């Protein structure tokens, strides 16, 4: 009885472990795929870029919000975003649709989310690092920026805005 059940349970567990493992592999293959598309742009560049959080509001690309949007290609724009307590400059960020947007976001105080609602933009912002991400907005309109990394008592009311023009 028991020696038959321990045999059968185990013979079937073995199939299950094979199967689950393959599903896991398929997932891995599917994740690989995303890595090869443009949708992979939202993965932060691997890339250390230090900056001084004490001077970033006072010298450099972050120090004149109104010129933070800079054509860097024929169809690419770099945007220098400051994420601070409690908010984002510029407000708003204006970019052309269909243009590839390189966001270069840092913080002058604490860590901040940059989760662009309705998109896959969702990056952490660490003081003294520049986070780099890419998106091409595909519909024009207002997108809301949320902060999803607790940063003090103003956390719940820290939003920003990206306006995509046609």
């Amino acid at each position: 009885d028991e020696h038959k059940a321990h045999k059968a349970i185990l013979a079937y567990e073995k199939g299950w472990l094979a199967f689950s493992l393959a599903m896991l592999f398929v997932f891995i293959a599917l994740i690989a795929y995303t890595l090869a598309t443009h949708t992979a742009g939202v993965i932060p560049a691997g890339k250390l870029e230090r900056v001084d959080p004490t001077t970033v509001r006072q010298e450099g690309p972050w120090a004149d919000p109104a010129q933070a949007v800079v054509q860097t290609g024929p169809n690419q724009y770099t945007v220098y975003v400051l994420a601070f307590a409690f908010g984002y400059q510029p407000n708003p960020i204006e970019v052309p649709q269909g243009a590839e947007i390189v966001f270069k976001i840092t913080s002058p105080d604490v860590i901040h989310g940059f989760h662009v609602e309705g998109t896959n933009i969702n990056v952490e912002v660490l003081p003294g690092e520049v986070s780099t991400v890419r998106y091409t907005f595909k519909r024009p309109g207002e997108y809301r920026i949320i902060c999803n990394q607790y940063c003090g008592l103003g956390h719940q009311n820290m939003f920003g805005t990206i306006v995509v023009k046609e």
Partner: protein
């Protein structure tokens, strides 16, 4: 044969699959 255990891991696979394919889908929608 352990039909009961097999059921459980069946519900599991499906739950996993819905979750995972569910969010793969949302990902491409938002990308």
């Amino acid at each position: 044969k352990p039909k009961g255990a097999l059921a459980v891991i069946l519900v599991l696979t499906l739950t996993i699959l819905v979750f995972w394919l569910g969010v793969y889908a949302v990902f491409f929608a938002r990308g």
